[PDB]
Amino acid sequence: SSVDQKAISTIRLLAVDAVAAANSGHPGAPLGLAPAAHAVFKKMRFNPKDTKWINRDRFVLSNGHACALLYSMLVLYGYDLTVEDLKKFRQLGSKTPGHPENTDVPGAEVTTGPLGQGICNGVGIALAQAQFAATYNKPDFPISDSYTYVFLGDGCLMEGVSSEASSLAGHLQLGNLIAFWDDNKISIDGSTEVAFTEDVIARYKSYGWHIVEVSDADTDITAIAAAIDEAKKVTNKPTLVRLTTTIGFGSLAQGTHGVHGAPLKADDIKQLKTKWGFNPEESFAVPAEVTASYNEHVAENQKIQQQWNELFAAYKQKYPELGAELQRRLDGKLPENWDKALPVYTPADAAVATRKLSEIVLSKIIPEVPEIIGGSADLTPSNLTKAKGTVDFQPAATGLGDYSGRYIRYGVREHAMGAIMNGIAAFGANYKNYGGTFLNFVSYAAGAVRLSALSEFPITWVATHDSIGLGEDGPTHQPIETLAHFRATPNISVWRPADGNETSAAYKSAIESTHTPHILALTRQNLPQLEGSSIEKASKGGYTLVQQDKADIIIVATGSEVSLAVDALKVLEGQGIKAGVVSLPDQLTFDKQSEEYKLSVLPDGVPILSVEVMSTFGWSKYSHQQFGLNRFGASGKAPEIFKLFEFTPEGVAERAAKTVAFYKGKDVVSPLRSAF
Amino acid sequence: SSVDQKAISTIRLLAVDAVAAANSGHPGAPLGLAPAAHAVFKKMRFNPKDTKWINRDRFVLSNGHACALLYSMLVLYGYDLTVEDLKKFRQLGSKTPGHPENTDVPGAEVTTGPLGQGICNGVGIALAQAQFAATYNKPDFPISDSYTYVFLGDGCLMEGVSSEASSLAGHLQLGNLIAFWDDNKISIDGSTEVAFTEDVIARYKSYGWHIVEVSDADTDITAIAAAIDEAKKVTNKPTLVRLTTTIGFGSLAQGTHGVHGAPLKADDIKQLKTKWGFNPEESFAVPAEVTASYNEHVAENQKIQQQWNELFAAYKQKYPELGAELQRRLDGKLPENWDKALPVYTPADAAVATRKLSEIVLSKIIPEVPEIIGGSADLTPSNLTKAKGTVDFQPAATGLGDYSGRYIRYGVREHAMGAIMNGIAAFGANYKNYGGTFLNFVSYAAGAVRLSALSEFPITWVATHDSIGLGEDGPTHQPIETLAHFRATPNISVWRPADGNETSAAYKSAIESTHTPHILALTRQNLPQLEGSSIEKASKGGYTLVQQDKADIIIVATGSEVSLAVDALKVLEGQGIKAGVVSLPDQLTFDKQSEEYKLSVLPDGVPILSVEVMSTFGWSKYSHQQFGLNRFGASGKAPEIFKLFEFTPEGVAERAAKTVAFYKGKDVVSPLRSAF
Numbered sequence A, B: 001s002s003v004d005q006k007a008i009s010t011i012r013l014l015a016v017d018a019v020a021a022a023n024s025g026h027p028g029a030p031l032g033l034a035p036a037a038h039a040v041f042k043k044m045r046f047n048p049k050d051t052k053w054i055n056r057d058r059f060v061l062s063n064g065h066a067c068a069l070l071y072s073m074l075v076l077y078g079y080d081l082t083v084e085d086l087k088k089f090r091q092l093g094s095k096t097p098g099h100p101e102n103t104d105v106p107g108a109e110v111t112t113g114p115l116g117q118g119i120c121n122g123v124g125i126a127l128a129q130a131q132f133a134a135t136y137n138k139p140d141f142p143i144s145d146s147y148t149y150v151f152l153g154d155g156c157l158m159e160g161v162s163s164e165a166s167s168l169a170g171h172l173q174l175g176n177l178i179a180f181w182d183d184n185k186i187s188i189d190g191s192t193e194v195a196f197t198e199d200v201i202a203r204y205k206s207y208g209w210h211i212v213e214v215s216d217a218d219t220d221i222t223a224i225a226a227a228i229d230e231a232k233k234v235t236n237k238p239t240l241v242r243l244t245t246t247i248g249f250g251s252l253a254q255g256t257h258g259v260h261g262a263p264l265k266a267d268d269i270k271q272l273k274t275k276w277g278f279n280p281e282e283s284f285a286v287p288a289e290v291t292a293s294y295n296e297h298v299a300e301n302q303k304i305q306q307q308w309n310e311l312f313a314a315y316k317q318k319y320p321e322l323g324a325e326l327q328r329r330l331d332g333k334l335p336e337n338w339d340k341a342l343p344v345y346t347p348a349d350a351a352v353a354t355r356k357l358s359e360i361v362l363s364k365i366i367p368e369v370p371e372i373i374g375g376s377a378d379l380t381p382s383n384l385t386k387a388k389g390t391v392d393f394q395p396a397a398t399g400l401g402d403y404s405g406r407y408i409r410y411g412v413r414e415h416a417m418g419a420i421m422n423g424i425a426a427f428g429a430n431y432k433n434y435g436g437t438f439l440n441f442v443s444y445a446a447g448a449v450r451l452s453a454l455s456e457f458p459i460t461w462v463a464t465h466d467s468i469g470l471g472e473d474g475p476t477h478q479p480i481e482t483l484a485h486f487r488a489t490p491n492i493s494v495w496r497p498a499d500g501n502e503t504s505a506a507y508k509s510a511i512e513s514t515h516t517p518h519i520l521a522l523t524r525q526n527l528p529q530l531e532g533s534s535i536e537k538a539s540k541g542g543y544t545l546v547q548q549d550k551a552d553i554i555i556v557a558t559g560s561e562v563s564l565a566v567d568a569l570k571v572l573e574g575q576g577i578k579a580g581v582v583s584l585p586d587q588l589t590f591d592k593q594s595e596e597y598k599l600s601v602l603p604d605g606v607p608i609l610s611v612e613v614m615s616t617f618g619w620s621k622y623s624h625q626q627f628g629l630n631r632f633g634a635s636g637k638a639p640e641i642f643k644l645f646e647f648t649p650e651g652v653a654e655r656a657a658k659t660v661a662f663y664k665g666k667d668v669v670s671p672l673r674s675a676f
């Protein structure tokens, strides 16, 4: 019956009432975690009226099904979310969707719900904060000193992605990361004894985390606050706080799987209210004393931000160049004319693999754009992702790098790399971050990649060894389905550049992006510089490489197959067939061009054949016939594999000639046309 | 200079010479692991002339890049792989591909190369062995008593999938699993100090594994053998053997990342040979004393198998029913007329969600087909994957199940579930095993799913909550790209049944499969029983549901959209448009039908519109126009989401009418036609 106790009851009952109104959602974890949420938010620095303050503490709800809890906190603190929004929990079009979405929910830093992601996002927010602080802080100028608080449950701890990120976070000594495990011994299938009997705490010690255990987290907010204070004293380890809770605390059904994921019974809600001093006839109650208490904390936080703004002004006076850089980044702007650093090629230049062209781009743009950081999942000398002369992001205590470093050694951890990249993007400050692996193993990170798209984060995958062109490693390494998968996902730019100019256009798009993740599919093998390519034309996503006003056929291709199409054009000329060539380095960018531009590239009245050594899925958007690879690859020298599958100038020409013959006497309209 | 030492040198030099001949591949781990490989194979029971002996010990090379080591062992032991095959390492069409493939390589139990998979496959082989032994062994009849030996490296230990499987294997007390960590402190990016500093051994203890450490695994084969003996005494824990090795042992470049993944220099190979007593001018040497020693072990193993065959004959006399069941399973045959247990429905029956129809199928077929086992990734009460009256697969010591159980509690571990299923299939004995999750989270397991397809394993995903039809959980849970991804992968049957009869056909296909993995996309929401459906017709993958000889349009649909198409047909009739309906429950099965059958379903001369509330990718194989969902979903009541996106009878009818109008005056041929 203190104000703190009343606040905790208010949180619990708002969450339960939201689930009740929707007749859908998850009351168990909100009931169990309300004390911890109250305690953590009271320690956090944040401004509900400025969700982007760069020195705010960040909170991540990794157990995203518990979002009625998050929404209740945001409402109580006066974010741009109200009780009326809570009444619309899980209703079409509301600001309170069934799992939190950063695009829709003020105060949701990331999109969670798919288990394991949020803790990894928290690792990335903390990684970014450490890099940012190392870049900008000066004596008497703690520009960045914020913490990252993460709630997670048993499901997050079972998902392998969280193990990857936790191993890495311990290695990186990320002392401003404080995670809280909802140790409630229940998941959907019942007791954790049925599937999850590991010693979690011993595992986290093995990663180099600090541990604090709170044995009565249903009530002991003093101990939760003390655990935070303890964690802040351990500056060289991330901390895991074990919150031993009862799922559904207070419910008649507390401590059971039934309270995880379905609305409580009406009589249960009544007894909750009466036990805690609330009116069982009232829903969505917000006692004004709770509002007052929370408003006091907001007002204090706003005074902290006000002082930070003055610190920043003084920083700009003392450190004019760093201050201007920081201001530009907080405004969301890249350096003026940064793109003049992009390499440009001519057809007289030598053939180069697009992985090597990518290395060259990075080596030119990293010195010009400080907000670029990135790494590789143990493939640095293969993906070619590190610029010479940069230092790795490591704790200085290791001697292996510094937090001011710009290159991240992710280890063999693609999925966590993907989710950490999302967290780096979520930090803000214009970070443009990237992660390298082989294209076929981007698939290990599909859970996170999809969330990059849904969350609208401008992350970049440097995805080398894109096809059978990699050769001898064979079919376990050779993508077939991978581009189709990601192209079929909304809001993913999938660049497959053919040459030096196209590779620079791909990076221009990836770095300028503010709302769209990028995958750059890059070759092991050398490709020629194309006659007709440029950054300008490739920036349109698709363009006419070879214009033929009397074309019998247009060949549309990507990447390594554009040069193949150009060679096929010459074979076809000897057969009396005139071809044009279209290069389609990014289907999403192309799709976003005007209808008239797109029709200038893929006109009516001419058959169009696509060529790409991967799945034919998607290609009918742009072509009448498709020459692709819809079977697994082979282990051998790459030129021999191309010959086996007839991806040769003669093989393409044969299929082009068959396409011309198939449409003889038919009326052909652009693949871009549709009935609706 | 003992025969054992000569054998180890022979293995090392065969592997190095294979890499040298290919001028491609990985010599480092083979050099470091040859002592351990020698020691392990000397302890293993196997018949090179009968790779399918059901009581063999299994070996898995999880660090599949080290396959020159595996191939050398198989050659030396007289599997159907020769020195001439080793000379063709990594060459197109050879039996020695750059990573091991179970379909191509005699003695390769699984396909490895993508890191982390093999250890999880080993967990599944061991899980299957325990279940099999619990089912069949009797006093004096140890029908199954075999071990599972796995080699893995640092990369496997960094991949989250291995953490998932190792947590689960420890929980399951899988004492016949013995894994060996190649602790060589090197990965591609250099020292493990840069990214992988966790206390691996402490982590494995936290999972409940037993540990043996071999501090000089470059030479101490006595200690490696003793570690195996020790592991066999610990019957209630899987064991991790830490093999401290030097990568590239013996090379001038030993202990460096450069020896991981590129051929050795010719002068290095010369000094290796002279140091070990071999002729530096000779490649692919096989000393006859090594062959003799290995042949002695093979002969002993063959006598063990001979005795096992007599044990099996005596078992059939004493336990005639179990013996006949075991024989049938070893012959690869399902029970005669098992499919008479499949439920059959009529259009007079009530509407049912396909997840519930799936539960009903499983409840009928599990009692009839003992080789069906399966589980869920913490979604048992949502996926509806457990048959009432079955017991969980657990060690009896827990009180929670028994190894004779048939239902696996995977926990929140989709990726490991996928790779464990591959291992269960790889065990053999006709296991037909399944794993449940929400369709959108099958994507977490993409690495393993792709390997199910490449490995030709008949595993089944019970993938419920397939679309926006799930409603309130919202876009983080609602598949868009997922079916396109898996349909674009070679050799995946992706069933999306519309009703009770189609769900039974999907299971008939999944259980009869011997070479093709299945994904069953199942609904949360109720669907009507269709007029015109049957197991017989749905077994063709695609069929004419509503035949209209004067059709103006055919609507092709799957799953929940078939009923929508039927309702749209009625709207269209009021607009003067006659439609037919095709149901396409599995595109792969359909594609495999005769050309004439397929054309009877998708004829020339009529526009075809597809309807499926997911990506339109792939659908142009079967339709002229596509009505799909190419954006993320929404959080709300499912009927309201369908209305928002116009997946209504009127919305489908409008697009069908526009399709008819678009093709007025045009000649239309089947989407099945192509130019080549």
Ligand SMILES: Cc1ncc(C[n+]2csc(CCOP(=O)(O)OP(=O)(O)O)c2C)c(N)n1
Residues within 6 Å of the ligand: A028, A029, A063, A065, A113, A114, A115, A116, A153, A154, A155, A156, A159, A182, A184, A186, A187, A188, A247, A260, B377, B378, B379, B412, B441, B444
């Ligand atoms: C990757 C992924 N797999 C499966 C699910 C389905 N799901 C949601 S919550 C949940 C389990 C909840 O377990 P826990 O994290 O312990 O939550 P608590 O029940 O204690 O609230 C599951 C399996 C999911 N959301 N994400």
Ligand SMILES: Cc1ncc(C[n+]2csc(CCOP(=O)(O)OP(=O)(O)O)c2C)c(N)n1
Residues within 6 Å of the ligand: A377, A378, A379, A412, A441, A444, B028, B029, B063, B065, B113, B114, B115, B116, B153, B154, B155, B156, B159, B182, B184, B186, B187, B188, B247, B260
């Ligand atoms: C999922 C996946 N990601 C990345 C790779 C690329 N790759 C192959 S071997 C290897 C690293 C080798 O490290 P380790 O397992 O320690 O092998 P060792 O160098 O000691 O032989 C990597 C990253 C892969 N094969 N699979």
Ligand SMILES: [Ca+2]
Residues within 6 Å of the ligand: A153, A154, A155, A182, A184, A185, A186, A187
């Ligand atoms: Ca829990």
Ligand SMILES: [Ca+2]
Residues within 6 Å of the ligand: B153, B154, B155, B182, B184, B185, B186, B187
């Ligand atoms: Ca290693």
